[PDB]
Design a protein around this nucleic acid. Sequence first.
RNA 1: GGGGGAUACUGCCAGACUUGGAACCGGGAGAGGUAAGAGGUACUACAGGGGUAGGAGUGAAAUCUUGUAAUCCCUGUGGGAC
Length: 123
Amino acid sequence: MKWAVAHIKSSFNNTIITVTDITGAETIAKSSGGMVVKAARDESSPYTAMQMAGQLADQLKDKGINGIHIRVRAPGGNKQRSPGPGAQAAIRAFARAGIRIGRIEDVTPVPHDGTRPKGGRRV
RNA sequence: GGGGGAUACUGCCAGACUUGGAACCGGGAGAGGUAAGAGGUACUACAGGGGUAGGAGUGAAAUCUUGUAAUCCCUGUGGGAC
Ligand SMILES: [Mg+2]
């Protein structure tokens, strides 16, 4: 019974995923949108997220881990705040890969009043 | 310009009257003001540990950034705004 935690940085342009142990100071598997898929336009797709979850599940099985919690985050703060579409797709692809999922937490770093939000309002 | 009559009216004279404003007390309300301090989270700087082919961004791209190990993750120490 080995427990791991997968970090999913889901954006509107990418959904990088890295898998660590409980302490988090050691990583096991990692794969971003462009790590396996060669199109930047399709790096944030749910199909790319399921491909990343599948290609991480076999490495997790090789390392000896069958269950991972999910710590999903958006960029957060002075950028995009809500989680992207790749989070639920990655977690469902992990659950369909055989890897059990327990707790899933949305841990996007939320600022109360952080630095100045870069934006153009209408543009 | 100057005389007589009137006293409502307004201006003059001396009080008063409490409603108008002014002053004080009571339990409450308020992102009211200055002064001081602490705090919240995020960000960021460097350093350390893990890990290894891209991260960022776009309508799509490229500059930019990354093999001097970035992205992501963990630890720690400072930073200024908010
Ligand atoms: Mg403009």
